[PDB]
Design a protein around this nucleic acid. Sequence first.
RNA 1: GGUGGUGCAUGGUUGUCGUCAGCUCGUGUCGUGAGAUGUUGGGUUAAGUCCCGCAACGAGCGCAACCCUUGAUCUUAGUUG
RNA 2: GGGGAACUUGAGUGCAGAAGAGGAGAGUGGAAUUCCACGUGUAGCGGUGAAAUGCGUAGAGAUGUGGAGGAACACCAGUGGCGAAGGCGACUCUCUGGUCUGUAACUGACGCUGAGGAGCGAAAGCGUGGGGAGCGAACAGGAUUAGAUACCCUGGUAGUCCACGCCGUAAACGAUGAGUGCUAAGUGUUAGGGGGUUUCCGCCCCUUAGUGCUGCAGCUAACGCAUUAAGCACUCCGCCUGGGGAGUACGGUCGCAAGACUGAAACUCAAAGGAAUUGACGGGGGCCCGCACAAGCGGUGGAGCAUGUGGUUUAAUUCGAAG
Lengths: 64, 109, 164
Amino acid sequence: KVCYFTSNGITHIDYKDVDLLKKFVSERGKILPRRVTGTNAKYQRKLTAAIKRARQMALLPYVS
Amino acid sequence: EKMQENGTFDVLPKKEVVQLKKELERLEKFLGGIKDMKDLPDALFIIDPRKERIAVAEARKLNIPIIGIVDTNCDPDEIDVVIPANDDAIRAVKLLTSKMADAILEAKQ
Amino acid sequence: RIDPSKLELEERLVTVNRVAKVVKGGRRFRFAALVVVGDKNGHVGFGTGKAQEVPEAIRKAVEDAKKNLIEVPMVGTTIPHEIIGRFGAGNILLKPASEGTGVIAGGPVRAVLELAGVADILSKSLGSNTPINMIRATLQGLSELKRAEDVAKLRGKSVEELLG
RNA sequence: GGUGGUGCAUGGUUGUCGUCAGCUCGUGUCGUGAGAUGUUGGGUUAAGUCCCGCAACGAGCGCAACCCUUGAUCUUAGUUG
RNA sequence: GGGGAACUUGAGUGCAGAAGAGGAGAGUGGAAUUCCACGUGUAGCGGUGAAAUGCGUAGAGAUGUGGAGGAACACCAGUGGCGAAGGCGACUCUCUGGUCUGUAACUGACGCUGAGGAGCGAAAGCGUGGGGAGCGAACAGGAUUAGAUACCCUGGUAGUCCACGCCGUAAACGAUGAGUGCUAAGUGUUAGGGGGUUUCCGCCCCUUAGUGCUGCAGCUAACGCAUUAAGCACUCCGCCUGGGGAGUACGGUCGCAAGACUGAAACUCAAAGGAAUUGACGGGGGCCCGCACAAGCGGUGGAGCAUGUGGUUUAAUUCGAAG
């Protein structure tokens, strides 16, 4: 598919961008996989670097 | 073929159908118009040895210089005469076989 | 090139192996054969021999023998130089010598060199003692021989310059 | 002369796997060689039956068939029927 | 080989980048297991091939909130990252190792390998305390079975877990000792860099580095291996010389011990193993067949009697046939 980040060409996720993150989160709260989203390896490793932190600030759910 | 028109054609009406004419449909296809050979020839023309290395092997194995249009992935170690062209252009495979058939046509004198 | 069948082949056998195969009932004993075939003027070859009998395997050895021959240089009834063949775990080296030295070779190998006409070879079967591969150890080395006038033509050089 | 001995000296003779769908050869190649291909793959059949595909093309012993019986009818022949 | 002097590609340094589950430290959460407090609520749940032991009218199991406590860190997860190997996956911070690119600024061969020596090295085990929710050797119980000191079954001690000290072994595996160059491709994939139209996105091409697969020459005994070599060459270190006896005994070091490392011999077989092929078998799979089985009918094994071999019995019970 198409990388969502390279469509913007965008750097650092800036963790408060919850609605930008919620596109990459599944229905119940799990992490959407790489091959469905079609991101990049540099970007996919920043996602779990970001998504896990917003889980610890209650901005992203664990299991909903 | 001597039997079906000149020989004993009247044995059964279906011995020829099950066996003889079923043989006639096979060998006129699968042994075709090379049938009047009676000799070991000294040349061969093919279209794709990369598709059909199998035919080239025994021709190579008896030291026979052969010709052929080849694809770019073919074997120049194998063939003595390299002809690089489109393997599936219907005009070009008619064109290149026209020059070679007219080569031996003028060489009949 | 391919050596033609317009020669005088002498074709004495080397060994016979009885060779089995195990079916529902029991074994099936057939025979194997290999015959060194050639003249005494520089053309040596062989073929395999497979049948269900003794003598028809001797027949079918001659076919692939006449399908596969090879030629050896006979400089002074010697091999022209020294070489070591290495085909398939049987090493057999080849050394030239003077003309009185006879044919000192292994069992099956002695039935090869006399079927070259070349009567001056020292050799020693380094590798295994198996009859097919020792003959494969000979002709593969004999294939890699060279002639004195040929390599001077390869180098673009004088033939006598290879000697002096 | 032995119906004396050994069917692990034998011919011959039959059972048996089972009337099961199999066993090989010739040529060609394949693999240093043993062997492998043909016989495997696809579709069927009671079946190596048969078609298609197929580095194999073929042939041989098998299967079936031609042999009998019973099941219909005609010709010829009708007694002891 | 030695000495004297230069060059910069080998290797190193600067500088500019980029990747990271690399290590060590103190702290932080989120589901989930159990435990316990209690509401609500009734006869069972629990477990298996089947079933029992265990748990339960004293109120279990299920369910609702709340509480303690440990250890494990889903999703991302990928022949994906990194380390020399063992290994490391929640999160953040502090501290710290190397890696790769970009050149050129610098050094002027400063390098490679390395016996002994040194340090690291999963799991088990050891010594001292800490902590012990799951899990769990030993043992116990219930089955299973001719036997069950086993697989199953409910519990269950050490352990695992932490700090610190030691043992220093494994299929510690890529069954491939480390480095340098060279030798068709095609192909993904992780990190870059250069360019070509383009801010782009992108496509295409060139290019370093690990990372996988299919492949030529050649190597190979065959399977296979193939720019990450088992190709062709070279420098260095370890190891093997038939199998068992045996990694045993003895002798010595080391350790808190368990045992590790160095390491035999008398004896004895003519062979033990390597890949490969045809077979036969499989309480391995796939297709498929016969009264084989299922769905039925009628008998045999009880009863007398005929008959046939057994054994036994006799003067001999003629000999042969034995799933």
